[PDB]
């Protein structure tokens, strides 16, 4: 069986995916999201979310859905043979539109674990009392990125580890660290200058970092792992532009878990008898946001992806991870309890916070053909089984049949069930993750020059639509 | 069937004597993938389906079902009446079923 | 059902003249005279019908006589017959024996030529299949026991019910047809039905203004404005005020005809057998 | 890799011109029409239940055509070819006269006759059950295939985890598919439902179907299965009209909505039962409308299986409600008396059925190439296991050490010898298994269906007298 | 509550017709013999034609 032997190495998609000269334009309309920047406003009695968390420090992982090209109808009839070939989309252009004005938005904690300002201290103050927390706010480090792949991105953060079963651990001991790899989901917080760490687990204090990140994981994209994966599916190309400087040098109150060795200093006297806390922490500050340093609102043409998957959108899917903290202005809107008053009163006005993001994604796809011979079939199967399976290529009808029984009123009583509880067939394993599912099944258009990215692509390629009107040019 | 204090339908009404008007929905042929697609120019042509054949399957066994009213307005059987009946009092209704 | 094609809710305040099946309903008969005389022949281009009935029992009606018998139609009696019995007769209908031979269904119907001018063209990507079948109306009577302990039958122990189950399965063979829209054909189609052209194309520099709609995420929450169904969209089906049994065949099309009973029936009718791949037979 | 799109048997199955005739001698069956008789202490069946409304699902067993010794086997090569039987003709002979038998219940849940009521029904009491009989719906059918048929009926399902079920609630329905077996009751005009579960009354339908499951053949699913094995031929006739219109008795489980009628007063204050049921009746039976006693030539099957009897098997399902005459017997307890006494005679019921099947089988050769082998293996694996070809012998030899004195107490226990034969996948089902292994004959001229086939094909017999 | 004297009963019947014809034009060369024959058949025919 199988005259050829399995290919032992990963080959580039330029070897079995044949590219055609048919291009399509797809685009979302305009994606808005209003919410609270620091926490979700839940009900006092129920835990239904009334105003969700929509901040500028969040990952925005869009899960683009493309139409199945094995069920389309291009200006052809039988250009592809459905018994030997199968079609697939290849992303050849992207543009991540952004809507709101540039700006920086601060956050903070009403009770932040800050002892004193160790930047320029006047003298030696007494030791910490009880509940030495202040209300401190800070603007985070500035970040922009754009990951594009056909599989979800992959983050990294420091979590808590399980200490070896040889040490005797006492309460209050330092939790061991371990670098955890997790898929980035829409709504994960991007690191802010305090590190890529688990803040719920590693800081039981709940009072060291600001409100938006005090009980959440801050992840960083694992480029080392994402570019070194064999098939290169989760990263076609990426951009990143981070910047930060330390604004204020602070301290941290609490029991010194690990004391300064008596070798590194000379024992003091008087007011300097007990060492001030040497758990320093800086306040990040992402500096000036400018318009010339923007990653977005520009077209990005994929000439050659980083890995071996050269932009092929396997499984009719595509992921656009987007972070930018350069449009993160929280709008401060208030309301009046009574309009009858003619003087001012701090107890008369109830203040609120909001944040509104605006996106608009446009793409340019190119139809591709994969003539599924024997060895190409074995390769596509070993790379990803659900690829070769979710288009039913090498399958006969099973001897049983697929005659469903559908009831016309499936909510009513006295028909046995809703009849579809178990997710047995075609359930993508991303059941568990939450993305900004974008449905581009009704948005493809072969009229390229009618859309802004379409005519940008036409310019870059050097083409133009054939004239509908006769002479009169220029 | 509906629970009296609410107004939600628990069991709908499904008799043999109703119209079954099906509203089929066909795929848009101008957005389809055929063996070949460039057979019709999208700028001066359009596609459409035509019904060439149809078959309405039916599953249950043959049979006649009967219905009726628990209080049906009948006075007397006038097919063959032995003699003159009495006079109509109040509420002379009867329970009578019939195959349609 | 044998009681006329009338509106029983408004024409009979008695609420007791016809069975519970059509006590407050409207009994409608297909208007063949009007559906056939339609200019374009869209509403129907193929139909079958069987209907049989005989008068089983002959009855009377109780109530105040609405129109008296004219006194020159009968000779006045005296005694018991001094007051007239009600002459408002109504027959109890009866559809006779059902048979497997007289069946209209479970058979393929090849629409070779339609009745009107629309020769089977499903305009607007739409098809309507109206079906009445009073030959499978068996109502299954089923009961439940409120007490499984009792070993003596008691009418107050068993609760009786009535049920009915329909089973359908529709199969079609569609044919792709192409229409070259010149000026003449375009104006003729715009005269026939403007929605046809308004649904494809051919005249729309779509707006002069943008048509980009900005959709919100988490649109159930109370942090935004009013994002729920308030302004309408091109959602306007002209048949939205009507309730049909919807059937979505958008994902059920298949060019492998010989894989389905009606597909290979159509092949066998047209000859047109599939090409044998397996060597020699 | 291999293939899609199930293909007709006319592509890999090559026909020959060798025809054989096989036929059962005569199949008789006597019994009781309503219920099976059994001893009080035991449960051995003394007189089975042989009704005219049961399915007769014959499982025919054909001889393996690969172990036929043909004189010149040079027409097929057992190294690369295998043989199979194709059913070309069939006749389902019926023996008894035309007649209609009736069934009933001594305690049937019937309140009154609501066809034409002379006055509003009086009070309802306890146990208004009557003794009512009825002749059922008329039915004939004959399904033939290489797999058992598939039936359909409505059954009780489990309700959701949403509604609190009170005692006496209506059981939810569900269309359940099953294999039709020999002795399953055909639908009789009361529907295709599970009367054991859906009616705890045990008094709503007559005696022979009050505990049974009336099934209907599922043609929608049998013709739509991919390979077309369950049936490749079927005929059916069925007629029924409503003879009488009745009423039910019991606590009304669903009240009539108050906006359908106008409340009564006095005699008509309590609503009479609105649960109706008609008694079916299959009218005149005729010899002109007979499906059976006729030869059927299976030229073009309905599916892709053009009459190939895979696995040397054939299932003939038959319903004949046209010869359901139940004969009423009687025995005298004492043969001395000179005066009639009802206590002197023991009344009985008996029903006798009579069948006679005949088939004309055509021999066909399947040349097993690689793709034909893969296709047949995907379609059915027990085919390529029944025919010695696949499963090439993976392992090698291994010593078993064969202890000499196995029943001694100086060694361990040598016991193994474990397996009982495990072959039959259709062992759970009950069919009227017909064995045609010693009944094949190449002399079609000598059998009635054989000479009918010869006459229909032309092909007169070779002359022997000058 | 239902009362017989509360409801008046009537009977009605409605017919529905639709007549369609296909007519063909015919010419009659009115010679002497044809005119005499039509005058013997029906003279109002020869009258309504003036």
Numbering used by the authors:
A (entry chain A): 12 to 485
B (entry chain F): 52 to 151
C (entry chain F): 203 to 483
D (entry chain B): 16 to 481
E (entry chain E): 354 to 403
Task: Give sentences from the paper.
Human papillomaviruses are non-enveloped, circular dsDNA containing viruses with capsids comprised of 360 copies of the major capsid protein, L1, and an uncertain number of the minor structural protein, L217,18. Five copies of L1 intertwine to form each of the 72 capsomers that make up the T = 7d icosahedron. L1 takes the form of the ubiquitous jellyroll of anti-parallel beta strands (BIDG and CHEF), which are connected by flexible loops that extend outward from the surface of the capsomer and constitute the majority of the L1 hypervariable regions. The asymmetric unit is comprised of six L1s, five of which make up a single hexavalent capsomer and one L1 that contributes to a pentavalent capsomer.
Quasiviruses were used throughout the work described here. In this study we used a subparticle refinement approach that allowed us to overcome the previous resolution barriers in HPV structural studies. The high resolution capsomer maps were recombined into an icosahedral capsid with 3.1 Å resolution overall (ISECC_recombine), a dramatic improvement over the original 4.5 Å map. The recombined map allowed the full asymmetric unit of HPV to be unambiguously built for the first time. For the six chains of the asymmetric unit (chains A–F) there was strong continuous density stretching from Tyr12 to Arg485 (A), Val16 to Phe480 (B), Met1 to Phe480 (C & D), Leu3 to Gly483 (E), and Met1 to Gly483 (F) respectively. The improved resolution of our map when compared to the previous 4.3 Å structure (Guan et al.) allowed us to correct the 36 residues making up the C-terminal arm extensions (402–439). The pentavalent and hexavalent L1 capsomers share a common core architecture but have different connecting arm structures (residues 402–439). The connecting arm extends from the base of the donor capsomer, looping into the neighboring capsomer to make a disulfide bond between Cys428 of the connecting arm and Cys175 of the neighboring capsomer, and then returns to the donor above the initial extension. The most compact conformation was in L1 chains A and F, whereas in chains D and E the conformation was the most extended, with chains B and C exhibiting an intermediate structure. The second, larger putative L2 density, approximately six amino acids, was found flanking an L1 loop region that extended from Ser306 to Ile327.
